[PDB]
Chain A
């Protein structure tokens, strides 16, 4: 008969795990709660939740679990099934899923002093409010709020878990150096913890662990930013084509079709939240508007190129501006009645070529204008996306 059996029989002769340990009426049980993030599984922005593999680290003192180790074979510590001992139901309040409790229910460790220590494992799905303004170049601030679902501040007192050395107090999510899987998409920046009670309700002591995770946007870059840049290059090129070739529309509208295809590609990844427009979506819409304006201006250029003296008469103002003002600033600078018919056709062709030259000047002007506009817009959007860096202060 191993004396551990006798010790268990002695401890749990009248022990009731349905009452909190209070040696005197009105005594509060101090519970230290910490977190150990083994793997940040996912942050699904479509449903705005984060799935994390965690080890909750609870430590309290049950005065009923005391014994003299000298009276036994030096049994300083003991391993008890979790269901056989009292435990504060330290649950995750802000869970997107309906599950509050832990998943594993590992054995609790009890010292002869009564210091019960518990390290259960869980797969928590906590609701995280996605700040979708700079997606994908965004830093998310997700939170995990742990507290006793039933016991208020007049029955339990929450504290931060002590380190391996009991002298200090850990104010952060303890990340195990080994046995930790670094998430491919997200990067941890700050992982603090704070006990944040609310003033309106005095009995709302709870411990909150924050994760400031910055996204690595390489996937979204390679799959949307570069193709949009190529489409923008094509839209700028549209105005270098000659109208006589007959492919201005065949290029511009096909670039628009490619933009639509990229929008279809992005339709399954952008968050479904209407607080703000993601910067990637703003860039997509800017490129789409630019391509639409390229189509419109190519249509205008083609209409100006095919204008004819027998269909249009060149106005005085156009003949003035597009002949004597822009070319300096754009570096263009250009047997009886048979003869009479040829001369008339020559004059008609001269006026037609004047229309064509006006079209060419307008085409060059639109080329320069759209190059400038596209470059400025893309540079501004990328600058704004780049400047979005999580604050050094975590505001723990």
Chain B
């Protein structure tokens, strides 16, 4: 018959294998668990909930001296398969997760070698909580970490470790989220860059506690802003540049205010669009948000200036008098500095004609004042708008994650170059 049943009965039943007892000869010693993470695919990073949903295969390995046998004795059985419900497993738990999952999703069989070496690769869907650095949205990169801990045993009983591959000759620790180049599908609007892994110890706490050791797998994910550049960015900057042209419209055609105010309405619509796409954090205003505020205040200033120009255009001698200094400075400096381009009835009618002509000439002077202040405001505002938007978006575009995943560590965690 099958020898596996006899081997299982010998290992688990005859030998009184206690599932709840740590697999160690003496209570004083420690059990080393080497674990690794394999990112099957990055499902999503919902910034409105600050939730990173990912699918990861978690690889644990340890030594259970009770699960050992003489291979030659039991018909040369090399590998053995056992459900987790029958053997001791280390409950490595994702401590930081907004959803209360805390565990792998499958609990697949463990593989046991005759020398006691046990490996286990359960898959899991993890919804971890990582804060969103929204400073340079949408040209931003996020730093989301998965923190695994051993909350059932303290560091004096089990010590979590990074798995160490055996490269030609020596063994090198695996300090990265191993990702299959062939069977990995790149996520939309997110690309992984550094993906380091590190085991951390906190000396301020004591070994006889569950807070002493952690294993953290970090993900530095850069957002692809193509969707935002196509939909939110380009139309908004185009509408802004359109508002910048309200000065070129003559005051005679009564749409000077209408275009600017309708551009303001369009920017309000864009503000409504962009509000629904970010978390309500207050670390800093997002790049899109602060650019939107800048351009909205600039459009409001353009509206105020257009109102002032219109007020100056309809000044009349019956209501206002142009002072000598005002018309002097305007009509002398600004066009040059801006390179602009019976018989009693007859007597009465001629007098009225002359008075109307003088009134018309003063109205024309007011119109010229309006035109020249309009051109001055255009030359002051349009360069400001263009330079401001270019500076904002260039500063956003130049935002890249640092070449090294950690601050002072020069190692540049990567599967290409292992250490030790």
Q: A residues within 8 Å of B by Cβ? A: 1-5, 8, 38-39, 41-42, 51, 53, 73-75, 77, 79-81, 84, 103-104, 106-107, 119, 121-123, 164, 176-179, 181-182, 184-185, 216-220, 222-223, 226-227, 230, 233-234, 237, 240-242, 244-247, 250-251, 254-255, 257-258, 261-262, 264-265, 268-269, 334-336, 338-340, 342-343, 346, 353, 356-357, 360
Q: With A38-B96, A223-B289, A230-B297 known to touch, is A265 a contact of B152 (CB < 8 Å)? A: no
Give A321 Cβ to nearest chain B Cβ, in Å: 19
Which residues of chain B come closer than 8 Å to A251, judged between CB atoms? 257, 261, 303, 307
18 pairs, CB–CB < 8 Å, chain A vs chain B: A2-B27, A4-B22, A5-B16, A8-B21, A39-B129, A79-B22, A106-B151, A122-B100, A182-B131, A216-B281, A217-B282, A226-B297, A247-B257, A250-B257, A262-B272, A334-B318, A335-B346, A339-B346
Give A383 Cβ to nearest chain B Cβ, in Å: 21
Give A35 Cβ to nearest chain B Cβ, in Å: 15
With beta carbons under 8 angstroms apart, the residue of A41, A107, A268 that contacts B153 is A107
Determine the residue in chain B with the shortest Cβ distance to A223: B275
Q: With A222-B293, A245-B310 known to touch, is A123 a contact of B152 (CB < 8 Å)? A: no
Taking the complex as formed, is B112 at the interface, i.e. its CB lies under 8 A from any CB of chain A?
no
Cβ contact within 8 Å between A244 and B282? no
Which residues of chain B come closer than 8 Å to A177, judged between CB atoms? 204
Q: With A184-B131, A353-B318 known to touch, is A234 a contact of B303 (CB < 8 Å)? A: yes
Give A166 Cβ to nearest chain B Cβ, in Å: 14
CA distance A74 to B27 in the complex (A): 8
Cβ contact within 8 Å between A342 and B98? no
> What 5 pairs across the A-B complex have the smallest Cβ distances?
A184-B281, A216-B282, A218-B282, A123-B100, A339-B345
Cβ contact within 8 Å between B300 and A230? yes
Which residues of chain B come closer than 8 Å to A262, judged between CB atoms? 268, 272
Give B149 Cβ to nearest chain A Cβ, in Å: 8
Give B298 Cβ to nearest chain A Cβ, in Å: 10
Q: With A122-B100, A247-B256, A339-B348 known to touch, is A5 a contact of B18 (CB < 8 Å)? A: yes
Give A329 Cβ to nearest chain B Cβ, in Å: 18
CA distance A236 to B140 in the complex (A): 39
Give B19 Cβ to nearest chain A Cβ, in Å: 9
Per-position 1/0 for B258-280, Cβ under 8 A of A: 10011011001101100110111
Taking the complex as formed, is B304 at the interface, i.e. its CB lies under 8 A from any CB of chain A?
yes
Cβ contact within 8 Å between A258 and B265? yes
Taking the complex as formed, is B171 at the interface, i.e. its CB lies under 8 A from any CB of chain A?
no
With beta carbons under 8 angstroms apart, the residue of B18, B151, B262, B314 that contacts A121 is B151
Cβ contact within 8 Å between A2 and B157? no
CA distance A218 to B345 in the complex (A): 73
Q: With A179-B95, A250-B261 known to touch, is A104 a contact of B27 (CB < 8 Å)? A: no
Taking the complex as formed, is B231 at the interface, i.e. its CB lies under 8 A from any CB of chain A?
no
Determine the residue in chain A with the shortest Cβ distance to B312: A242
Q: Beyond the given A179-B202, A237-B304, A268-B276, could you list 14 further A-B residue pairs with CB under 8 A, ordered by the A residue number?
A: A2-B27, A4-B27, A5-B18, A39-B96, A79-B153, A178-B204, A179-B214, A223-B275, A240-B311, A251-B257, A261-B265, A265-B272, A335-B345, A342-B352
Give A229 Cβ to nearest chain B Cβ, in Å: 9
Give B240 Cβ to nearest chain A Cβ, in Å: 15
Taking the complex as formed, is B296 at the interface, i.e. its CB lies under 8 A from any CB of chain A?
yes
Q: With A227-B296, A268-B276, A343-B348 known to touch, is A254 a contact of B262 (CB < 8 Å)? A: yes
Per-position 1/0 for B280-319, Cβ under 8 A of A: 1111010001100100110010011001101101100011
Cβ contact within 8 Å between B257 and A342? no
Taking the complex as formed, is B400 at the interface, i.e. its CB lies under 8 A from any CB of chain A?
no
Determine the residue in chain A with the shortest Cβ distance to B145: A181
Q: Which of B343-382 contact A (CB under 8 A)?
A: 344-346, 348-349, 352
CA distance A315 to B163 in the complex (A): 96
CA distance A42 to B414 in the complex (A): 35
Cβ contact within 8 Å between B93 and A104? yes
Cβ contact within 8 Å between A241 and B282? no
Cβ contact within 8 Å between B21 and A123? no
Cβ contact within 8 Å between B272 and A261? yes
Q: With A104-B151, A185-B281, A353-B318 known to touch, is A73 a contact of B28 (CB < 8 Å)? A: yes
CA distance A3 to B282 in the complex (A): 56
Output the residue of B100, B131, B265 with the most chain A CB within 10 A.
B100
Q: With A185-B280, A254-B261, A357-B319 known to touch, is A241 a contact of B348 (CB < 8 Å)? A: no
CA distance A303 to B152 in the complex (A): 81
CA distance A182 to B129 in the complex (A): 11
Which residues of chain B come closer than 8 Å to A240, judged between CB atoms? 307-308, 311
Taking the complex as formed, is B53 at the interface, i.e. its CB lies under 8 A from any CB of chain A?
no
Cβ contact within 8 Å between B345 and A336? yes
Cβ contact within 8 Å between B24 and A2? yes
CA distance A5 to B278 in the complex (A): 54
With beta carbons under 8 angstroms apart, the residue of B129, B257, B264 that contacts A245 is B257
With beta carbons under 8 angstroms apart, the residue of B27, B102, B204, B268 that contacts A103 is B102
Which residues of chain B come closer than 8 Å to A233, judged between CB atoms? 300, 304
CA distance A338 to B147 in the complex (A): 97
Cβ contact within 8 Å between A241 and B281? no
Taking the complex as formed, is B211 at the interface, i.e. its CB lies under 8 A from any CB of chain A?
yes
Cβ contact within 8 Å between A346 and B352? yes
Cβ contact within 8 Å between B285 and A218? yes
Cβ contact within 8 Å between A265 and B157? no
Which residues of chain A come closer than 8 Å to B153, judged between CB atoms? 79, 107
Give B29 Cβ to nearest chain A Cβ, in Å: 10
Give B320 Cβ to nearest chain A Cβ, in Å: 9
Cβ contact within 8 Å between A254 and B265? yes
CA distance A42 to B129 in the complex (A): 11
Which residues of chain A come closer than 8 Å to B268, judged between CB atoms? 227, 258, 261-262
CA distance A182 to B342 in the complex (A): 95
With beta carbons under 8 angstroms apart, the residue of A73, A178, A342 that contacts B202 is A178
Cβ contact within 8 Å between B129 and A41? yes
CA distance A254 to B5 in the complex (A): 82
Which residues of chain A come closer than 8 Å to B278, judged between CB atoms? 219
Which residues of chain B come closer than 8 Å to A257, judged between CB atoms? 265
Cβ contact within 8 Å between B281 and A179? no
Which residues of chain A come closer than 8 Å to B210, judged between CB atoms? 106, 119
Cβ contact within 8 Å between B100 and A103? yes
CA distance A185 to B283 in the complex (A): 8
Taking the complex as formed, is B20 at the interface, i.e. its CB lies under 8 A from any CB of chain A?
yes
Give B147 Cβ to nearest chain A Cβ, in Å: 7
Q: With A38-B96, A242-B310 known to touch, is A121 a contact of B257 (CB < 8 Å)? A: no
Q: With A107-B153, A123-B99, A264-B272 known to touch, is A247 a contact of B293 (CB < 8 Å)? A: no
CA distance A84 to B214 in the complex (A): 27
Give B294 Cβ to nearest chain A Cβ, in Å: 11
Which residues of chain B come closer than 8 Å to A338, judged between CB atoms? 345, 349
Give B308 Cβ to nearest chain A Cβ, in Å: 8
CA distance A246 to B206 in the complex (A): 77
Taking the complex as formed, is B199 at the interface, i.e. its CB lies under 8 A from any CB of chain A?
no
Which residues of chain A come closer than 8 Å to B254, judged between CB atoms? 245-247
